[PDB]
Every structure is written in structure tokens, then in C-alpha cells.
């Protein structure tokens, strides 16, 4: 019925879904892999959006982060890895994404996440934020923690894909 309408997003059934999953991914962990795997099972397409210039200087640079993530997620056919240096909402608009994936680990974060969702709603009303809890297995891991453990020779082989594990070991002398 194209001559009459292009159609709207809401109230007319299910639409094509393209999700962004933004983060610093410094480096990507099994926790991140689990989140994106789950999102990729329920949305048509998913972009892992790696922030180029985070406020805290990352251990891996953008090129390394993007390279590691690409390798770790190559087995997922509807997932693509990109870097971005913008607001998550501006990147979403640029990529014609309509879904924003956010991991929800801690109760402390909930308030901040709700506030961010309200801001993103203001910036891009057509972008829906969607929240996934991490699996129980990955619920206590973070990039930061895995790095600090690894720096003092703690075993983190269970928390990272092999390619990331090797790269991390190289960063730490």
C-alpha cells in the first residue's frame, strides 16, 4: 500500500530490528559475548559499537579492541563490529538502528541506566532501549576486574575467549 503510506513504527505489528550494543570493550569478555549472542538471537541485526575515545585511557586501542571483538564474534552471522566517536544516539541514527542494547549487572547502575534511557528517548524517540541481565556465570566479571586479576597473574582463562586471553597476556609483559 506504498502509494498511500510508508507506514509507521508503532501499532502496526512487528518491524525489522537493528540493534546497537555500545561499550568500551577493553577488552571484550565472555560476559559481553553472552549479551550480544542473546541479542543477536532476538533481533535481525546487531552492531557491537566500540567507543573510540573513552574518558579513561583504555589498555587496548580502538584498532585492537575492534580486531579482538571481530574475531570473537565472527561465528554470529547477524553481528557486525564497528568503532564510533559520537553519542550512542547519534551513531544509532547514523546506522538506522532502532534498538539499543544495555547490559544490567548491578542495582547501583539501574538509576543511571534509566536516566540515560530517558536522555536517549529525548535525543532519538524512535530508538528503544532494551536491557539484558548477564548470565549467572558472568555476573561478577568486568573488563576492569579481569585486567587487574591478570596483572597479578590470577587465572582468567575462564572469562575471556582465547584470542583476547593471548592479547591480554602480551599487554602484561
Amino acid at each position: 500500500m506504498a502509494s498511500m503510506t510508508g507506514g509507521q513504527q508503532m501499532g502496526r505489528g512487528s518491524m525489522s530490528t537493528k540493534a546497537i550494543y555500545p561499550g568500551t570493550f577493553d577488552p571484550i569478555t565472555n560476559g559481553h559475548i553472552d549479551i550480544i549472542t542473546r541479542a543477536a538471537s532476538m533481533f535481525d541485526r546487531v552492531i557491537l559499537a566500540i567507543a573510540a575515545s573513552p574518558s579513561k585511557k583504555p589498555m587496548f586501542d580502538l584498532e585492537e579492541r575492534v580486531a579482538l571483538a571481530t574475531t570473537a564474534l565472527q561465528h554470529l552471522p547477524n553481528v557486525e563490529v564497528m568503532g564510533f566517536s559520537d553519542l550512542m544516539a547519534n551513531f544509532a541514527r547514523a546506522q538506522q538502528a532502532n534498538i539499543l542494547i544495555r547490559g544490567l549487572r548491578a542495582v547501583a547502575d539501574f538509576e543511571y541506566e534509566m536516566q540515560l534511557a530517558h536522555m536517549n528517548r529525548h535525543l532519538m524517540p524512535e530508538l528503544e532501549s532494551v536491557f539484558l541481565m548477564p548470565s549467572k556465570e558472568w555476573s561478577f566479571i568486568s573488563s576492569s576486574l579481569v585486567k587487574e586479576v591478570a596483572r597479578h597473574a590470577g587465572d582468567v582463562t575462564h572469562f575471556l575467549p582465547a584470542n583476547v586471553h593471548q592479547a591480554l597476556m602480551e599487554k602484561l609483559k
Copy 2:
């Protein structure tokens, strides 16, 4: 291929907040079932038939949404309905803890069911069924928080 989501609750009664959540979910999933719990441990103001009837009317305009009652383990209901997604609205910090616990249990019961969380719109962020009822019980104006059919039914329950 297909996504089929369940959005469970007591919906006693359905509010504009619930309507917002399910509208958003129905835009991203092929099918959505509003699953209304038949026998909640606290006795509801509206019975299942009334809850289901009100919700059906409020959501009739959404073509990929179906309203049903259920009286079984959510995992068993989801399996029966061939659902692979579980929608929960997330309003408060207090709720998040309980919902994370439930999600971990549901992962144990039904690994193939993915729980998904939506924040309510800013407009509906402070409303709940319980609050709207308590306000209405003492003649507060709640016309802004309910669809007309639910508003009329609530007024009747309190007169």
C-alpha cells in the same frame, strides 16, 4: 525467524504504563501475549475474567497482541505457547533485584526463554496499579493514568 514474547503480570487493572510497555514490545517482536496471572497470592480487586476483558479492550488496536490468563509455572506456559521471549517492565530498583532472581530461576527451568527488560516511559515512571487504586479509593483524579474502559470499571468497583 519468529519471535514470540510473553508479558506476564497481575494487571489489576492494566494501566497506561503497561500499555506503553506492551506497545513497545509489540513493535519489536512478531507476537506478544499479555499473560494475566489467574491466582495471585494477594486477592486482586478485579477477577481474572474482568482483568482479561479490560486488557483485551485496551489492547485491541494492537494486531500482534493477544491477552490470556494463565495459572501455571511461567516456564510451562511459555513452552505451551511456543514463546521464546519474556518481557518485564522495570520501574524501581527494588523490583530489579527480584526480577534478576526470577530470571536466573527461569533460565534454570527454561534455558531457551530469554528475559528482556524495558524501562517505563518518563510519563508513566511513577504509576503502578496499586498506586492508582489507592489514589482512586480516596477520590483522587486518575483519568490520566488509565484507558477510559478501565477508568469506568474502577469507578464502578469503588461505588
